[PDB]
PDB file of all heavy atoms in Angstrom:
ATOM      1  N   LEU W 380     366.089 185.095 250.963  1.00  0.00           N
ATOM      2  CA  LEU W 380     364.606 185.086 250.815  1.00  0.00           C
ATOM      3  C   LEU W 380     364.023 186.489 250.898  1.00  0.00           C
ATOM      4  O   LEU W 380     362.800 186.641 250.686  1.00  0.00           O
ATOM      5  CB  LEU W 380     363.979 184.189 251.893  1.00  0.00           C
ATOM      6  CG  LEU W 380     364.295 182.695 251.827  1.00  0.00           C
ATOM      7  CD1 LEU W 380     363.554 181.991 252.976  1.00  0.00           C
ATOM      8  CD2 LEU W 380     363.935 182.063 250.489  1.00  0.00           C
ATOM      9  N   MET W 381     364.795 187.484 251.320  1.00  0.00           N
ATOM     10  CA  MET W 381     364.218 188.788 251.698  1.00  0.00           C
ATOM     11  C   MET W 381     363.614 189.508 250.487  1.00  0.00           C
ATOM     12  O   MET W 381     362.559 190.146 250.614  1.00  0.00           O
ATOM     13  CB  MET W 381     365.265 189.631 252.437  1.00  0.00           C
ATOM     14  CG  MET W 381     365.528 189.108 253.859  1.00  0.00           C
ATOM     15  SD  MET W 381     363.928 188.926 254.749  1.00  0.00           S
ATOM     16  CE  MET W 381     364.399 187.609 255.872  1.00  0.00           C
ATOM     17  N   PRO W 382     364.198 189.479 249.255  1.00  0.00           N
ATOM     18  CA  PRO W 382     363.506 190.082 248.114  1.00  0.00           C
ATOM     19  C   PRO W 382     362.106 189.491 247.872  1.00  0.00           C
ATOM     20  O   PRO W 382     361.173 190.244 247.642  1.00  0.00           O
ATOM     21  CB  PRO W 382     364.441 189.825 246.927  1.00  0.00           C
ATOM     22  CG  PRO W 382     365.805 189.691 247.561  1.00  0.00           C
ATOM     23  CD  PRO W 382     365.536 188.991 248.898  1.00  0.00           C
ATOM     24  N   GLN W 383     361.955 188.175 247.957  1.00  0.00           N
ATOM     25  CA  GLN W 383     360.619 187.513 247.812  1.00  0.00           C
ATOM     26  C   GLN W 383     359.717 187.980 248.972  1.00  0.00           C
ATOM     27  O   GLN W 383     358.504 188.275 248.751  1.00  0.00           O
ATOM     28  CB  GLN W 383     360.785 185.994 247.836  1.00  0.00           C
ATOM     29  CG  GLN W 383     361.246 185.372 246.524  1.00  0.00           C
ATOM     30  CD  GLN W 383     361.476 183.891 246.680  1.00  0.00           C
ATOM     31  OE1 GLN W 383     360.537 183.099 246.735  1.00  0.00           O
ATOM     32  NE2 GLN W 383     362.730 183.487 246.744  1.00  0.00           N
ATOM     33  N   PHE W 384     360.270 188.055 250.197  1.00  0.00           N
ATOM     34  CA  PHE W 384     359.457 188.473 251.369  1.00  0.00           C
ATOM     35  C   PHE W 384     358.997 189.913 251.181  1.00  0.00           C
ATOM     36  O   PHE W 384     357.825 190.237 251.490  1.00  0.00           O
ATOM     37  CB  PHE W 384     360.195 188.320 252.695  1.00  0.00           C
ATOM     38  CG  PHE W 384     360.092 186.954 253.306  1.00  0.00           C
ATOM     39  CD1 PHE W 384     361.234 186.262 253.663  1.00  0.00           C
ATOM     40  CD2 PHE W 384     358.850 186.393 253.607  1.00  0.00           C
ATOM     41  CE1 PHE W 384     361.153 185.012 254.254  1.00  0.00           C
ATOM     42  CE2 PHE W 384     358.773 185.140 254.194  1.00  0.00           C
ATOM     43  CZ  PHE W 384     359.925 184.451 254.507  1.00  0.00           C
ATOM     44  N   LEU W 385     359.876 190.786 250.674  1.00  0.00           N
ATOM     45  CA  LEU W 385     359.501 192.218 250.562  1.00  0.00           C
ATOM     46  C   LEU W 385     358.314 192.368 249.622  1.00  0.00           C
ATOM     47  O   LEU W 385     357.399 193.116 249.948  1.00  0.00           O
ATOM     48  CB  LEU W 385     360.682 193.040 250.060  1.00  0.00           C
ATOM     49  CG  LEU W 385     360.408 194.539 249.995  1.00  0.00           C
ATOM     50  CD1 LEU W 385     360.158 195.103 251.395  1.00  0.00           C
ATOM     51  CD2 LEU W 385     361.584 195.266 249.348  1.00  0.00           C
ATOM     52  N   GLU W 386     358.356 191.701 248.472  1.00  0.00           N
ATOM     53  CA  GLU W 386     357.257 191.679 247.478  1.00  0.00           C
ATOM     54  C   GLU W 386     355.978 191.185 248.162  1.00  0.00           C
ATOM     55  O   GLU W 386     354.907 191.824 247.987  1.00  0.00           O
ATOM     56  CB  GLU W 386     357.612 190.771 246.295  1.00  0.00           C
ATOM     57  CG  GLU W 386     356.699 190.982 245.107  1.00  0.00           C
ATOM     58  CD  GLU W 386     357.085 192.208 244.279  1.00  0.00           C
ATOM     59  OE1 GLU W 386     358.312 192.364 243.931  1.00  0.00           O
ATOM     60  OE2 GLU W 386     356.182 193.024 244.017  1.00  0.00           O
ATOM     61  N   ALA W 387     356.084 190.108 248.941  1.00  0.00           N
ATOM     62  CA  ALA W 387     354.935 189.527 249.691  1.00  0.00           C
ATOM     63  C   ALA W 387     354.357 190.547 250.693  1.00  0.00           C
ATOM     64  O   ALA W 387     353.103 190.734 250.757  1.00  0.00           O
ATOM     65  CB  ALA W 387     355.380 188.264 250.392  1.00  0.00           C
ATOM     66  N   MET W 388     355.234 191.234 251.429  1.00  0.00           N
ATOM     67  CA  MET W 388     354.847 192.224 252.467  1.00  0.00           C
ATOM     68  C   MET W 388     354.174 193.424 251.785  1.00  0.00           C
ATOM     69  O   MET W 388     353.120 193.848 252.256  1.00  0.00           O
ATOM     70  CB  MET W 388     356.067 192.685 253.268  1.00  0.00           C
ATOM     71  CG  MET W 388     356.674 191.610 254.178  1.00  0.00           C
ATOM     72  SD  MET W 388     358.354 192.064 254.588  1.00  0.00           S
ATOM     73  CE  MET W 388     358.188 192.548 256.311  1.00  0.00           C
ATOM     74  N   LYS W 389     354.763 193.953 250.702  1.00  0.00           N
ATOM     75  CA  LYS W 389     354.202 195.117 249.962  1.00  0.00           C
ATOM     76  C   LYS W 389     352.814 194.752 249.433  1.00  0.00           C
ATOM     77  O   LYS W 389     351.914 195.610 249.502  1.00  0.00           O
ATOM     78  CB  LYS W 389     355.153 195.557 248.838  1.00  0.00           C
ATOM     79  CG  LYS W 389     356.440 196.219 249.315  1.00  0.00           C
ATOM     80  CD  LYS W 389     357.467 196.415 248.214  1.00  0.00           C
ATOM     81  CE  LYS W 389     357.106 197.487 247.210  1.00  0.00           C
ATOM     82  NZ  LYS W 389     358.129 197.552 246.139  1.00  0.00           N
ATOM     83  N   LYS W 390     352.625 193.515 248.976  1.00  0.00           N
ATOM     84  CA  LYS W 390     351.314 193.059 248.445  1.00  0.00           C
ATOM     85  C   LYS W 390     350.311 193.116 249.602  1.00  0.00           C
ATOM     86  O   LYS W 390     349.208 193.649 249.427  1.00  0.00           O
ATOM     87  CB  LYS W 390     351.401 191.665 247.805  1.00  0.00           C
ATOM     88  CG  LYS W 390     350.060 191.122 247.325  1.00  0.00           C
ATOM     89  CD  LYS W 390     350.042 189.730 246.744  1.00  0.00           C
ATOM     90  CE  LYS W 390     348.616 189.257 246.578  1.00  0.00           C
ATOM     91  NZ  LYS W 390     348.551 187.835 246.167  1.00  0.00           N
ATOM     92  N   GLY W 391     350.699 192.635 250.782  1.00  0.00           N
ATOM     93  CA  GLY W 391     349.784 192.616 251.939  1.00  0.00           C
ATOM     94  C   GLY W 391     349.431 194.008 252.419  1.00  0.00           C
ATOM     95  O   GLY W 391     348.294 194.228 252.852  1.00  0.00           O
ATOM     96  N   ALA W 392     350.373 194.942 252.313  1.00  0.00           N
ATOM     97  CA  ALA W 392     350.226 196.333 252.786  1.00  0.00           C
ATOM     98  C   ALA W 392     349.410 197.172 251.788  1.00  0.00           C
ATOM     99  O   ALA W 392     349.046 198.277 252.169  1.00  0.00           O
ATOM    100  CB  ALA W 392     351.596 196.915 253.015  1.00  0.00           C
ATOM    101  N   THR W 393     349.152 196.689 250.559  1.00  0.00           N
ATOM    102  CA  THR W 393     348.561 197.525 249.469  1.00  0.00           C
ATOM    103  C   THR W 393     347.311 196.881 248.843  1.00  0.00           C
ATOM    104  O   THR W 393     346.579 197.606 248.190  1.00  0.00           O
ATOM    105  CB  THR W 393     349.583 197.846 248.366  1.00  0.00           C
ATOM    106  OG1 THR W 393     350.047 196.617 247.806  1.00  0.00           O
ATOM    107  CG2 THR W 393     350.748 198.701 248.832  1.00  0.00           C
ATOM    108  N   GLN W 394     347.076 195.587 249.027  1.00  0.00           N
ATOM    109  CA  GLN W 394     345.947 194.858 248.394  1.00  0.00           C
ATOM    110  C   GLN W 394     345.085 194.193 249.460  1.00  0.00           C
ATOM    111  O   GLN W 394     345.625 193.426 250.296  1.00  0.00           O
ATOM    112  CB  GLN W 394     346.442 193.781 247.443  1.00  0.00           C
ATOM    113  CG  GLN W 394     347.072 194.339 246.184  1.00  0.00           C
ATOM    114  CD  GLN W 394     347.461 193.209 245.265  1.00  0.00           C
ATOM    115  OE1 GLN W 394     346.847 192.140 245.247  1.00  0.00           O
ATOM    116  NE2 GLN W 394     348.526 193.428 244.519  1.00  0.00           N
ATOM    117  N   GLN W 395     343.787 194.445 249.355  1.00  0.00           N
ATOM    118  CA  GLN W 395     342.701 193.902 250.200  1.00  0.00           C
ATOM    119  C   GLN W 395     342.366 192.502 249.676  1.00  0.00           C
ATOM    120  O   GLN W 395     342.043 192.394 248.492  1.00  0.00           O
ATOM    121  CB  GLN W 395     341.533 194.883 250.077  1.00  0.00           C
ATOM    122  CG  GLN W 395     340.377 194.621 251.022  1.00  0.00           C
ATOM    123  CD  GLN W 395     340.525 195.373 252.328  1.00  0.00           C
ATOM    124  OE1 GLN W 395     340.659 196.606 252.382  1.00  0.00           O
ATOM    125  NE2 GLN W 395     340.487 194.612 253.405  1.00  0.00           N
ATOM    126  N   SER W 396     342.450 191.462 250.505  1.00  0.00           N
ATOM    127  CA  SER W 396     341.975 190.099 250.143  1.00  0.00           C
ATOM    128  C   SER W 396     340.443 190.070 250.093  1.00  0.00           C
ATOM    129  O   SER W 396     339.815 190.632 251.007  1.00  0.00           O
ATOM    130  CB  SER W 396     342.473 189.054 251.095  1.00  0.00           C
ATOM    131  OG  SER W 396     342.090 187.761 250.648  1.00  0.00           O
TER     132      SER W 396
END
Side-chain angles (χ1 to χ4, degrees):
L380 295 181
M381 287 308 152
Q383 280 176 76
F384 274 126
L385 183 64
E386 194 80 49
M388 291 160 107
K389 289 170 71 183
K390 176 183 169 187
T393 60
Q394 290 183 30
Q395 188 91 56
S396 185

